[PDB]
Amino acid sequence: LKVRTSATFRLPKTLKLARAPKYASKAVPHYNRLDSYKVIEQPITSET
RNA sequence: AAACUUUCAACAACGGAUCUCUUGGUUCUCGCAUCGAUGAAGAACGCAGCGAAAUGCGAUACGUAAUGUGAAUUGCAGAAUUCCGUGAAUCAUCGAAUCUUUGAACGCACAUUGCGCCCCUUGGUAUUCCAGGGGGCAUGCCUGUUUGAGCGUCAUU
């Protein structure tokens, strides 16, 4: 038998594997949703 | 005698009845079987040369691609080469795409446009800090994979 200095039993640590999907989630990455031309819309030309 | 009051007619008012009209309603009959985690129904906010609503659409925003028809659209402006043609159109069809923030709504929260973690990549003299872009992290259950727990228990050292 093992020696257990603590009377509390904890969940053992087990191996966790990274995902290895057999097909891509979307197969086409989306382009930049905020490029320079979308960030700046138009200058403001009021007198102030 | 006037004014005034009342009754009738004409013309003019007030009001919207009547008649006629109808792209609506109602009832009966016939045929068909197709919503959603491949993100539905619903909600919010946006999108047009000039638009508030309705209708349509999603930063590709009154639309993109494709197919058909074969010359419009129309309130104005504009564009004209689009006219014996891969080609006009607020046209029809529709099998390819886009599809903001949400919503059964799924990283955690939500009277907050609040707060984390992981992978790839870029910049800031950076595996650790900060920032940009792309891709991810809900719950119950089933089959399988892998890593384990218990003198529950077998055999052998």
Curated annotation (Swiss-Prot):
It is found in: Cytoplasm. There is a cross-link at K38 (Glycyl lysine isopeptide (Lys-Gly) (interchain with G-Cter in SUMO)). It comes from the Eukaryota. Component of the ribosome, a large ribonucleoprotein complex responsible for the synthesis of proteins in the cell. The small ribosomal subunit (SSU) binds messenger RNAs (mRNAs) and translates the encoded message by selecting cognate aminoacyl-transfer RNA (tRNA) molecules. The large subunit (LSU) contains the ribosomal catalytic site termed the peptidyl transferase center (PTC), which catalyzes the formation of peptide bonds, thereby polymerizing the amino acids delivered by tRNAs into a polypeptide chain. Belongs to the universal ribosomal protein uL23 family. Component of the large ribosomal subunit (LSU). Mature yeast ribosomes consist of a small (40S) and a large (60S) subunit. The 40S small subunit contains 1 molecule of ribosomal RNA (18S rRNA) and 33 different proteins (encoded by 57 genes). The large 60S subunit contains 3 rRNA molecules (25S, 5.8S and 5S rRNA) and 46 different proteins (encoded by 81 genes). uL23 is associated with the polypeptide exit tunnel. This is Large ribosomal subunit protein uL23. It comes from Saccharomyces cerevisiae (strain ATCC 204508 / S288c). The chain holds residues 24 to 71 of 142 of the full protein.
